[PDB]
Amino acid sequence: EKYSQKEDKYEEEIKVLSDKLKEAETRAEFAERSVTKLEKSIDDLEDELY
Amino acid sequence: YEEVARKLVIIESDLERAEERAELSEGKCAELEEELKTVTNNLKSLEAQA
Numbered sequence: 001e002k003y004s005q006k007e008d009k010y011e012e013e014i015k016v017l018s019d020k021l022k023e024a025e026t027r028a029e030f031a032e033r034s035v036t037k038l039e040k041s042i043d044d045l046e047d048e049l050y
Numbered sequence: 051y052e053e054v055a056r057k058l059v060i061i062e063s064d065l066e067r068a069e070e071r072a073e074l075s076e077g078k079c080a081e082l083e084e085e086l087k088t089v090t091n092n093l094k095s096l097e098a099q100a
Contacts, residue, residue: 003099003100004099
């Protein structure tokens with residue numbers, strides 16, 4: 001029973017980590033689009049500046 | 051003869067009791083072998099489950 005509950009606690013740690021990972025990865029990939037958008041805008045602004 | 055005949059009955063009755071205790075302690079030991087195998091198999095089930 002404590003190991004069934006740990007099966008659930010560990011499964012919950014996987015579920016929470018899966019949700020936190022989906023947020024960290026979605027935020028990382030979105031923020032990486034903000035990286036690429038800021039970077040592209042910086043290159044375009046540099047082409048304009050040039 | 052009467053002392054050993056009445057004590058023969060006591061000793062036959064104590065053989066019936068010594069044998070009854072052989073049967074009762076053996077019968078209970080065998081019940082405990084079954085209880086033990088049941089809790090050992092339940093323990094192995096719970097241990098396998100755990």
